[PDB]
């Protein structure tokens, strides 16, 4: 089935068992106090190595405290870092994966001041804790504080710190070393003409901008020797106006190859300061592969690997078969499913837990200096935790799950995996719940992969799925289970609005279930994520859509990474929006609003969608109580409205805790 993905490859002298690479992932799992590798990190990367990845890259480790850009970033500075690095490499290597250590000083994106650092020694001098760059400047992004200009001595010291970092990985058993020269971190800052305004030998011409990187590579190569795998990450496109051209990145890569033997090029898209789309659901698998083509026709000798929304085995298989890339590189697909390569090579892609590019647990949690998580994978950051271990139940119990939404299905899946006799009762004709409604939204197309995954799991695990079956007190009693799991989800709220009883008033459920005929003008009351995604579905159909929000902002519950994605779509679909509006009443011809400035305006509508929020659909739970079965639990939105991340996590936690005694 995936002959090309499962084909081996030589990276330097090292034979890699397949063409699947798990990319560097800072996750805030290392010791926040000192940058040491701890059990949370070890077990996280061990799961990717057990999952079958031919290559497993560590997260980018800082080379100096000023280069620390994440609260729990791994450190590559002191002798006290060595024991942890050895444990990490042992764990990856034992599984048969090629361990690769990444070196990443975050430069302009450093946040040492936020990590209890009040001063540091840099270039033999006492300095403040501010980020460093080739040129003293500010960021368009408020998360990044103004940087200080590195002295030539600090530059020389950082080259040596990179050599020492590579020495540290090699002495602790890592199979190779990766230089992170991307996305706006220190090296990328010297490479880009946007960040590098130096007039000495470290800036000006492209040759000078590349010097810091070249000297780092030359130094590492001399340190580790000729036989040791030296790989690197470099941008193919920075998506920065006034940055380097795509062709300049190729010239830099050519300078790299001429300086040292590069054993693998990982090619990347954008900077953290880039406004445009790079990693979102706006980009589909293969949307960036033309860049890999240009590197190949430019004559780059080293094998190439590429990630960046490559979440499909079929797309990667073709890309590798056609020689566009030599290795399928991935980060978020490996967060979502650490066993993706094992599934690809055993010919079961239907078992893949696909990353939907939600950017919640991964990007967003890491950037707000929180412990990384994953929406679709509740095990992320918990592989090391005994409370998340999946253990066979000795005494099989009869488990009745009410509701085939994500929380119900994840619970049923885990309870069946552990050996319980599981039944799902679902009132509609199909599984998915609100995920089955959301999949209709333009940016939620990868939610069909979540449906496909759970549909295939129910089948394989022998879960008794009872579709078109509304669970009642009587049908639960007839079933007589040992454990009743209520996972009936949420329902649209009914706020106290004048004229809410109008015929014009509908809800997000009736829209997505096709239970309402919509006109040419559709007006949404509510500016939350659910209201916006439904409005995008209504607008895609070529309808005139207005979103009215009483609060200060629309998309208020949408993480920073998805905000711009929604702006682009709303503009593209000619969607109108109003904020700080008072909803006065709903009537026959639309909705009467009063702006924050005092303007009374009539919003013309053929349909009024009241989408201010969701209530817990807890009628069944209130009707049956806690005594209808020996064990009664409520999970997901029926236990209190949260979102998809919490529903899936509640399901996993419910599924693992169902005891056998
Ligand atoms: C259009 C849309 C877009 C969304 N977008 C996002 C997003 O981007 N990110 C995010 O975090 N969240 C989003 N959400 C919310 C998210 O989908 C929900 O939080 C989540 O699906 C709730 O999971 P659940 O298992 O608790 O309930 P549900 O998904 O609501 O499932 C409940 C299930 O129980 C069934 N059922 C109900 N009563 C009975 C009964 N008595 N007997 C049998 N079956 C019954 C229902 O038919 C349904 O299948 C969105 C929701 C919608 C509708
Ligand atoms: C939480 C998170 C942390 C990341 N940490 C790193 C890092 O340590 N070093 C690095 O070079 N890239 C890092 N990246 C970039 C990824 O390795 C990857 O190239 C990117 O997410 C695009 O690939 P994908 O679509 O497979 O996720 C990070 C990405 C995420 C989601
Ligand atoms: S949190 Fe969302 S984007 Fe990140 S790995 Fe999980 S499914 Fe993918």
Numbering used by the authors: 13 to 673
Which text from the study accompanies this structure?
It belongs to a distinct subclass of the old yellow enzyme (OYE) family of flavoproteins that are composed of three domains binding FMN (flavin mononucleotide), a [4Fe–4S] cluster and either ADP or flavin adenine dinucleotide (FAD).
NCR is present in the crystal as a monomer modularly built up of a OYE-like TIM-barrel domain (19–359) hosting the active site FMN, an FAD binding α/β domain (401–503 + 626–674), and a second α/β domain (504–625). The FAD cofactor of NCR is located at the C-terminal end of the central β-sheet with its isoalloxazine moiety clamped between L456, W459, and L656 on the si-side and E541, I542, and K655 on the re-side. The surrounding of the isoalloxazine by negatively charged residues (E446, E541, and D649) destabilize the FADH− (deprotonated FAD HQ), but not the FADH• (protonated FAD SQ) state suggesting a low-redox potential, similar to that of flavins in flavodoxins. The bulky W459 in NCR (F424 in DCR) shifts the isoalloxazine moiety towards the re-side and thus totally blocks the NADPH binding site present in DCR. The Fe/S cluster in NCR was found in the crystal structure as a cysteine-coordinated [4Fe–4S] cluster, albeit with an incomplete occupancy. However, two major differences between NCR and standard OYEs were identified in the polypeptide surrounding of the isoalloxazine ring that should substantially modify its electrostatic/hydropathic properties. From these three only the arginine is present in NCR (R245), but a hydrogen bond to the negatively charged E341 counteracts its positive charge contacting the N1–C2–O group of FMN.
